[PDB]
Amino acid sequence: SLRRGIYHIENAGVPSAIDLKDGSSSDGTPIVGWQFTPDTINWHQLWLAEPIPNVADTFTLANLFSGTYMDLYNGSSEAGTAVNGWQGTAFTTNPHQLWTIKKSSDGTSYKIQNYGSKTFVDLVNGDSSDGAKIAGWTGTWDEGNPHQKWYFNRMSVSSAEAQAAIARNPHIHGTYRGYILDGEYLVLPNATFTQIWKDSGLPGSKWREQIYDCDDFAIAMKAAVGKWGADSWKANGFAIFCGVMLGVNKAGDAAHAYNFTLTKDHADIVFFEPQNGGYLNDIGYDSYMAFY
Amino acid sequence: SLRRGIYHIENAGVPSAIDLKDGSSSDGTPIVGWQFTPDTINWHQLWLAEPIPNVADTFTLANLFSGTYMDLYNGSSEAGTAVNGWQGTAFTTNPHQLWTIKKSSDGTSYKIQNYGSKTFVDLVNGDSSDGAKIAGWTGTWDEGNPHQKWYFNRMSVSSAEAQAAIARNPHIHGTYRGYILDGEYLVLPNATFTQIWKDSGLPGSKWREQIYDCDDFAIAMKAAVGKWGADSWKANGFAIFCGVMLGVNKAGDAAHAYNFTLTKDHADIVFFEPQNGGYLNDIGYDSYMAFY
Ligand SMILES: C[C@@H]1O[C@@H](O[C@@H]2[C@@H](O[C@H]3O[C@H](CO)[C@H](O)[C@H](O)[C@H]3O)[C@@H](O)[C@@H](CO)O[C@@H]2O)[C@@H](O)[C@H](O)[C@@H]1O
Ligand SMILES: C[C@@H]1O[C@@H](O[C@@H]2[C@@H](O[C@H]3O[C@H](CO)[C@H](O)[C@H](O)[C@H]3O)[C@@H](O)[C@@H](CO)O[C@@H]2O)[C@@H](O)[C@H](O)[C@@H]1O
Ligand SMILES: C[C@@H]1O[C@@H](O[C@@H]2[C@@H](O[C@H]3O[C@H](CO)[C@H](O)[C@H](O)[C@H]3O)[C@@H](O)[C@@H](CO)O[C@@H]2O)[C@@H](O)[C@H](O)[C@@H]1O
Ligand SMILES: C[C@@H]1O[C@@H](O[C@@H]2[C@@H](O[C@H]3O[C@H](CO)[C@H](O)[C@H](O)[C@H]3O)[C@@H](O)[C@@H](CO)O[C@@H]2O)[C@@H](O)[C@H](O)[C@@H]1O
Ligand SMILES: C[C@@H]1O[C@@H](O[C@@H]2[C@@H](O[C@H]3O[C@H](CO)[C@H](O)[C@H](O)[C@H]3O)[C@@H](O)[C@@H](CO)O[C@H]2O)[C@@H](O)[C@H](O)[C@@H]1O
Ligand SMILES: C[C@@H]1O[C@@H](O[C@@H]2[C@@H](O[C@H]3O[C@H](CO)[C@H](O)[C@H](O)[C@H]3O)[C@@H](O)[C@@H](CO)O[C@H]2O)[C@@H](O)[C@H](O)[C@@H]1O
Ligand SMILES: *[C@@H](C(=O)O)[C@H](O)C(=O)N[C@@H](CC(C)C)C(=O)NCCCCNC(N)=[NH2+]
Ligand SMILES: *[C@@H](C(=O)O)[C@H](O)C(=O)N[C@@H](CC(C)C)C(=O)NCCCCNC(N)=[NH2+]
Ligand SMILES: [Ca+2]
Ligand SMILES: [Ca+2]
Ligand SMILES: [Ca+2]
Ligand SMILES: [Ca+2]
Ligand SMILES: [Ca+2]
Ligand SMILES: [Ca+2]
Ligand code: NA
Ligand code: NA
């Protein structure tokens, strides 16, 4: 079954993502196909899938930027029915906003079925142009039609997935303890992680003994990413990934505070030095504590 | 022996503190007696005592605001010699800036002797008016003269002292682990702690599930206090006290993130709720983790 999380949803036949037009929170804003740039935040194209309790394989889909919900207009089962953003809530009983999402007959892409209409999210005519209509349409679970197939490319990790990534790192001290703060995390491309660092004022901050030293840079980076998350997204129910670590060197005679992020594949961590913006597979310290 | 730390230094005969006039970093700025307000940050009246290695009871005294050093002008042993702020470093060999500080014959106040001249810091004539001259003067270690006696009222804690304060709290979980970031900490009056919170923007921040929830408020408060410390003080070698805690309720079914500070007596901690500015002796959670 599809996991709770944040997805970039890409048509299987042409490289168009599901896009809430202009990111607008107005009710009735069209959801359209649109091109995308890999390894970026695609600002209007991220969707938080919230599973519904006791309704197998069925979800709301909140646009991360607008906080509004994928909605089949008036629930109609007519082919060509509008799919728009619309105000709602994560666990609504409104069928217009409830979507049964299960694997297609290719085993990798998914179909997206409205729970009330039983019709499917369809890139009309397989049109690849920017702004192409997405509609509800008649269909079947098993058929090959690529207009109705969608790759759910996962952009978040659970806390357990983050924990796993840490656990297979080679630079973890024997005394390590991790402290988990949230449940579901948007993983940032390094280009975005870097941007937040640049915009934080940290690049200009001078190292000063105790009063503005490693711990202060690492905590300030984590607070900057937290502030960015809230200021940037209107949906709730997830956090932004940015860890702090405390580590000790191999000799046991120096310790350091720094940050960490995750690889593009979500399988491994990467250290970040908030005093200079560098990313390192080996920062020269084994982590004895992390919070994230 | 006097401990490394930050002191407000108050004459024993009249309630005048040792004040670097206007907080000025100019070389030759006079150090004067001046009235003070208890339970405030007295901005021009805080002094960081750095012990010198292998020189018993002898220190530099850096003004916390200016980062300049108490200096006996040209080292003269003449009575009436100026005592001024002057550029220097924490472990200088310049005797003009080195001060042997030991208890007076009352056992509670201290005398402050220049290491090169062997003369003593003296509030001339015991003058209580704002701006009264402080000079080097002839004297003895044992005599009663209040012009040369000074109470060193300690405004910082060591990390070990902070640890002790935590350890005697009644609201510490059996699994608690603390992570110590710095060595010496300025303890803020709650009036100042509050000010930093108000100025941080946190009072206006809305609680939002995961994206701006308890952990984000607590971390943002700690980062605000860190930023305030660096922006406010020019001396190095100390930090500002502001902890983060993670805690669990008595039933074991709810957890929360918050901050903590220390009492005026430095003996106990006080919890702070960064979502509303409240101070509480009991926040309803036992801490299982802290960093500070
Ligand atoms: C059958 C109809 O269902 C609800 O109205 C839906 C709309 O529902 C959503 O928006 C309205 C405001 O327009 C409201 O906030 C509601 O809680 C939310 O779920 C929406 O799905 C539109 C477009 O497809 O269709 C309906 O107008 C409900 O509010 C109505 O009273 C009525 O029961
Ligand atoms: C090229 C074309 O592709 C398929 O038709 C799709 C449509 O497919 C869906 O709707 C049709 C009815 O119009 C039918 O219910 C089918 O099972 C269902 O998948 C639909 O995707 C539209 C809009 O994008 O485009 C095409 O018309 C195929 O069934 C046609 O025979 C034909 O090969
Ligand atoms: C004997 C004299 O000692 C030093 O000069 C001191 C001053 O020392 C402090 O300030 C100077 C700059 O004015 C410099 O930065 C130095 O490192 C610092 O310790 C100061 O104590 C004044 C006032 O009492 O007296 C002397 O001018 C040294 O720089 C001189 O070359 C010379 O050795
Ligand atoms: C009222 C006055 O108090 C004392 O004299 C202080 C001075 O005391 C210090 O300097 C004198 C020499 O002038 C002497 O060396 C003494 O041992 C030493 O403490 C000094 O504090 C000045 C400036 O503030 O004020 C007074 O003159 C006392 O010795 C006097 O006899 C007299 O009672
Ligand atoms: C916020 C905004 O994002 C970008 O424009 C979006 C646009 O973004 C997608 O399409 C562009 C090309 O038009 C690129 O492929 C991006 O990588 C995609 O993410 C769409 O989402 C449309 C329709 O909703 O809205 C635009 O605002 C970017 O071009 C803007 O400069 C800006 O950063
Ligand atoms: C930064 C500045 O601090 C205060 O003025 C200082 C002054 O502060 C002391 O004396 C005042 C009365 O003049 C109060 O008792 C304070 O509680 C003391 O800390 C002195 O340090 C003088 C001489 O260096 O400089 C002034 O700037 C305050 O009155 C100002 O408004 C301001 O906040
Ligand atoms: C880091 C820097 O600015 O380079 C700065 O030296 C610092 O604070 N170092 C601390 C450790 C960090 C907070 C992790 C430090 O060296 N502390 C002394 C020992 C305590 C940490 N080590 C262990 N294992 N407890
Ligand atoms: C706190 C709030 O905004 O009220 C928010 O619920 C939160 O993040 N709670 C977390 C705990 C904090 C990070 C301390 C939470 O409840 N986590 C679930 C359990 C993990 C924490 N408990 C223990 N002991 N590990
Ligand atoms: Ca057909
Ligand atoms: Ca949380
Ligand atoms: Ca620090
Ligand atoms: Ca005398
Ligand atoms: Ca430190
Ligand atoms: Ca959070
Ligand atoms: Na730097
Ligand atoms: Na509030």
DSSP 8-state assignment for residue B110: E
Same domain (yes/no): A147, A202: no
Q: Exposure pattern of B102-112 as b/e (b: 16+ CB <10 Å)? A: ebbeeeebbbb
B118 residue type, one letter: K
Nearest CA in chain B to A222: B219
The strand pair at B69-72 and B5-11 is best described as unpaired
The angle that helices A214-232 and B214-232 make with each other, rounded to 10 degrees, is 130
Q: Are residues A115 and A34 in the same domain?
A: yes
Q: Tell me the C-alpha distance between B267 and B289, whole Å.
A: 20
Cα B285 to Cα B132: distance, rounded to the nearest angstrom: 50
HSE toward the beta carbon, residue B216, CA cutoff 13 A = 26
**What is the distance in angstroms between the CA of the first residue and the CA of the last residue of chain A?**
27
CA gap A67, A89 in Å, rounded:
9
The data reach a resolution, in angstroms, of: 1.3
Which of A84, A21, A96, A62 lies closest to A238 in space, CA to CA? Answer: A62
Q: B183: nearest CA in chain A?
A: A210
Q: What gap in Å lies between CA B290 and CA B211, rounded to an integer?
A: 21
Q: Give strand pairing partners of B238.
A: none
- Concatenating the DSSP letter of every residue in chain A gives -PPSEEEEEEESSSS-EEEEGGG--STTEEEEEE---TTS--TT-EEEEEEPTTSTTEEEEEETTT--EEEEGGG--STTEEEEEE---TT---GGG-EEEEE-TTSSSEEEEETTT--EEEEGGG--STTEEEEEE---SS---GGG-EEEEE-EEEHHHHHHHHHT-S-EEEEEEEE---SEEEPPPHHHHHHHHHHTTGGGPPPBTTTBSHHHHHHHHHHHHHHHHHHH----S-EE--EEEEEE-TTSS-EEEEEEEE-TTSSSEEEEETTTTEEES--S-EEEEEE-
Q: Which amino acid appears at position B151 of this protein?
A: Y
Q: Is B177 within 8 Å of B291 (Cβ atoms)?
A: no
Burial B186-225 (b: 16+ CB within 10 A, else e): bbbbbebbbebbeebebeebeebebbbbbbbbbbbbbbbb
What distance in Å separates the CA atoms of residue A247 and residue A254, rounded to the nearest whole number?
Answer: 9
Three-state SS at B94: coil
Sequence-distant (6+) residues with CB within 8 A of B26 are B85
- C-alpha B84/C-alpha B79 separation (Å) is 15
Q: Residue B252: what are its φ and ψ, rounded to 5°?
A: 80, 15
Q: Which residue puts its alpha carbon closest to atom 19 of ligand 5?
A: A42
**Rounded distance between C-alpha atoms, residue B139 and residue B124, angstroms:** 13
Q: Which of A65, A208, A211 to mutate: most B Cβ within 10 Å?
A: A211
B210 lines ligand 6 (CB under 6 A): no
Chain B residues lying within 8 Å of A291, measured CB to CB: 289, 291
Q: Which residues of B are annotated as a binding site for Zn(2+)?
A: 8, 10, 96, 147, 171, 214, 256, 282, 286
Among A60, A56, A114, A118, CA closest to A89: A60
Cα B55 to Cα B33: distance, rounded to the nearest angstrom: 28
Which residues from A are below 8 Å from B226, CB to CB? 212, 216, 219-220
Angstrom distances, CA of residue A133 to CA of A82, A124, A129: 8, 6, 9
DSSP state of B3: P
Considering only CB atoms, A179 lies closest to which of B208, B226, B289, namely B289
Sheet hosting strand A286-291, strand order edge to edge = A172-179, A286-291, A243-248, A255-262, A269-273, A278-280
- Rounded to whole angstroms, the Cα distance separating A248 from A235 reads 38
Spatial CB neighbours of B199, under 8 Å, sequence gap ≥ 6 = B224, B228
Based on the fold, state whether residues B88 and B213 are members of the same structural domain: no
Residue B175, burial from CB neighbour count under 10 angstroms (0-12, 13-18, 19+)? exposed
Query: CB–CB of A192/A40 below 8 Å?
Result: yes
Picking from A210, A222, A223, the nearest residue to B183 by CB comes out as A210
SS3 assignment, position B212: strand
Which secondary structure element, helix H or strand E, spans residue B135, and what is its range?
A: strand B132-137
Residue B87 identity: Q
List ligand 2's pocket residues with C-beta within 6 A: A 79, 122, 124-125, 137-140, 143, 145, 147-148
Range of A196's domain?
154-292
Closest to A221 (Cα-Cα) out of A283, A144, A277: A277
Say how far apart CA A48 and CA A6 lie, in whole Å: 4
Tokens of B110: 């201290």
Distance CA A108, CA A77 (A): 26
Tokens 């666990």 — which residue? A91
Residues B236 and B121 in one domain: no
For chain A, how many structural domains are there in total? 2
Q: CB B129: neighbour CB atoms within 10 A?
A: 12
Secondary structure (3-state) at B24: coil
Torsional sign, CA A182, A186, A190, A193: negative
Q: Which two three-digit tokens encode residue B65? A: 């605001």
Q: How are beta strands B81-86 and A156-158 bridged, if at all?
A: unpaired
B86 contacts B27 by C-beta, under 8 angstroms:
yes
Determine the Cα–Cα distance for residues B234 and B66; give it in Å rounded to an integer: 5
Domain boundary among B153, B169, B194: B153
CATH no. for residue B57? 2.80.10.50
Select from A123, A153, A183 the last residue of a domain.
Answer: A153
Residues B160 and B149 in one domain: no
Task: Report the residue among B173, B205, B213 best suited for mutation to probe ligand 8: largest number of ligand atoms under 8 A from its CB.
Answer: B213
Q: Sort out which chain A residues have CB atoms less than 8 A from B223's CB and list them.
A: 219-220, 222-223
CA distance A84 to A261: 34
Q: Which is it for the CA torsion B83, B85, B91, B95, positive or negative?
A: negative
For tokens 């049964």, name the residue: A100
Q: Are residues B105 and B205 in the same domain?
A: no
| Strand B132-137, strand B120-123: pairing | antiparallel
Residue of A229, A222, A60 whose CA lies nearest to B211: A229
Within this chain, do residues A146 and A191 fall inside the same structural domain, yes or no?
A: no
Tokens of B128: 């209580």
Which H or E element spans position B244? strand B243-248
The answer to whether residues A18 and A9 touch, using CB atoms and an 8 Å cutoff, is yes
* E strand or H helix at B123: strand B120-123
Residue B145 shares a structural domain with residue B178:
no
Q: Which residues contact B46 (CB under 8 A, 6 or more apart)?
A: B6, B7, B8, B63, B64, B65, B155, B186
**Cα separation, A240 vs A227, whole angstroms:** 10
Same domain, residue pair B59 and B74: yes
User: Which residues of chain B make contact with A182, given a CB cutoff of 8 A?
Assistant: 210, 213, 215
End-to-end Cα separation, chain B, in angstroms = 27
Q: How many residues does this entry show for chain A?
A: 292
Helix, coil or strand: residue B85 = strand
Burial status of residue A199 (CB atoms within 10 A of its CB: 0-12, 13-18, 19 or more): exposed
CATH code for position B284: 3.30.460.70
CB B137 within 8 A of CB B111: no
Q: Is the CB of B255 under 6 A from ligand 8?
A: yes
The tokens of A277 are what? 């913006």
Domain boundary among B95, B129, B153: B153
- What does the alpha-carbon distance between residue B187 and residue B260 come to, in Å, rounded to a whole number? 11
Q: Are residues A258 and A223 in the same domain?
A: yes
Residue A116 CB: number of other CB atoms within 10 A? Answer: 15
Same domain for B163 and B175, yes or no, is yes
Amino acid letter at B195?
A: Q
B278 CB burial (10 A radius; 0-12, 13-18, 19+): exposed
**d(Cα B58, Cα B226) in Å, to the nearest integer?**
30
Query: Residue B40: CB partners within 8 Å, gap ≥ 6?
Result: B189, B191, B192
Query: What does the block give as tokens for B151?
Result: 């109470």
Q: How many CB atoms lie within 10 A of CB A258?
A: 25
* Residue B46 CA, ligand 6 centroid: distance in Å: 12
Cβ <8 Å between A230 and B238: no
- Identify the three-state secondary structure at position B93: coil
Question: Binding site residues of B, as ranges?
Answer: 8, 10, 96, 147, 171, 181-182, 210, 213-216, 256, 282, 286
CB contact at 8 A, B144 and B105? yes
Which run of H or E residues covers position B287? Answer: strand B286-291
| Cα B178 → chain centroid | 22
User: What is the residue with the minimal CA distance to atom 19 of ligand 8?
Assistant: B255
Residues of A with CB under 8 A from a CB of B: 177, 179, 181-184, 205, 208-213, 215-216, 219-220, 222-223, 226-227, 229-230, 233, 235-240, 246, 257, 289, 291
Same domain (yes/no): A112, A216:
no
Provide the 3-class DSSP secondary structure of residue B106: coil
Single out the residue of A156, A31, A49 nearest to residue A98, CA to CA: A49
Using CA atoms in the order B86, B90, B96, B98, what is the torsion angle rounded to 10 degrees?
Answer: 140
* Closest alpha carbon to B196 in B261, B256, B247: B261
